[PDB]
Amino acid sequence: KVFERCELARTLKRLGMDGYRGISLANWMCLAKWESGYNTRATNYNAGDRSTDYGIFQINSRYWCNDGKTPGAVNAAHLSCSALLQDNIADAAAAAKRVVRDPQGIRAWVAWRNRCQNRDVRQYVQGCGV
């Protein structure tokens, strides 16, 4: 499913993402925008290390979800990577929460550092009523 901007904003708010571990909704929106373009079936294979990023938040199979084919993998979030490809983003939200429960926080995603960090991210939630 490809979410519309405001539709995603409200869904994430309802999931308790606004301010989770100090991360504003606008930041989670910025991350989703650049990681997947708000697309839940987005998958990206990393040939270099044989891991795959899954879903709207591009969650990595090496540490957060289990896909069985990733070398030296762990299942920190304790989920099947399949769960991060559903239209319902509840599991993706719970996984994203687990990722940021580590000291790096939102910085775990390098795309966040490149396009979101130290930027005016208000544009991601403007007009959405959140």
- Give the active site residue among 53, 67, 102, 120: 53
- Give the active site residue among 7, 35, 67, 102: 35
Method: X-ray
Rounded Cα gap, residues 15 and 55, in angstroms: 16
Domain boundaries, the chain: 1-130
Please indicate whether residue 7 is annotated as part of the active site: no
CATH class (in words) of the domain with range 1-130: mainly alpha
Residue holding tokens 């309802």? 14
Rounded Cα gap, residues 44 and 59, in angstroms: 10
Strand 43-46 vs strand 65-66: parallel, antiparallel, or unpaired? unpaired
Given resolution (angstroms): 1.8
Q: What angle do CA 121, 28, 1 make, to 5 degrees?
A: 115
Please indicate whether residue 4 is annotated as part of the active site: no
